[PDB]
Design a binder for this molecule. Sequence first.
Ligand SMILES: C/C=C(\C#N)c1ccc(C(=O)O)cc1
Lengths: 272, 8
Amino acid sequence: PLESQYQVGPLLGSGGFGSVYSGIRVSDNLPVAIKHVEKDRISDWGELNGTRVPMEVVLLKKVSSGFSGVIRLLDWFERPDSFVLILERPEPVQDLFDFITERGALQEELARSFFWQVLEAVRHCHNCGVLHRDIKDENILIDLNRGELKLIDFGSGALLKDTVYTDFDGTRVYSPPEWIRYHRYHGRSAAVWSLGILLYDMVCGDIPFEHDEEIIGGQVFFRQRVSSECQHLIRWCLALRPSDRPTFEEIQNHPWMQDVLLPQETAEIHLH
Amino acid sequence: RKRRRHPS
Ligand SMILES: C/C=C(\C#N)c1ccc(C(=O)O)cc1
């Protein structure tokens, strides 16, 4: 019973996260987010046992662990017309889209710390067999007191595979040119493209491309002062041909990525 | 310049 195990509060974010409600687990007063998904709106289905569940539940369960870089699924329920997902809710929180809107372009030291944490989170997903497919600032929560970032919203994700993907329901302005042009992509190199968009977003204050023509055009204009090392990493992630993009290892060994702050240092210097 | 969210 969900209504007995949790005190359900008001809608979170007025629907901007979907049907996500504030909640508190009665057993130990743990803050939770209660996310409702309609069965009729579910694209991909998975199996858990023979239990047929939304793929989002499958992916969330596979990344659920002590690693704090991804949102933690605590439990889920099936209803006649929907599934209900119980997520551990950090507090206080602001998502990275709103953070950047309010702060503008981030100092590179702060962008480096945030980007590093996202890289570690995406590596965790991939190590667990999960491809997120919707990496963007809207899908990143900042724990403002701990300086820890959390990847959220696995509703566009897929099991990670090495063969080609021909479907996609993530965010188009973060999707790579081979998807725009050919409706085909491989998971890791597409993820690296979206991370280039995200890094540009952090250091310039908004994403670089709004239109298909800009995505495929292969030109990156910098609207803010950005170091040559950071520009190089961004341009490398945004290589037009997927095989020209860096691996996750090459990104984290890049000179711009060295000497990252710890999460607690990040919170004390930039967030408190 | 207009910064906006983008739906998935
Ligand atoms: C304040 C918002 C959340 C929390 N805590 C949240 C977490 C995960 C999701 C998601 O995975 O869709 C959506 C909202």
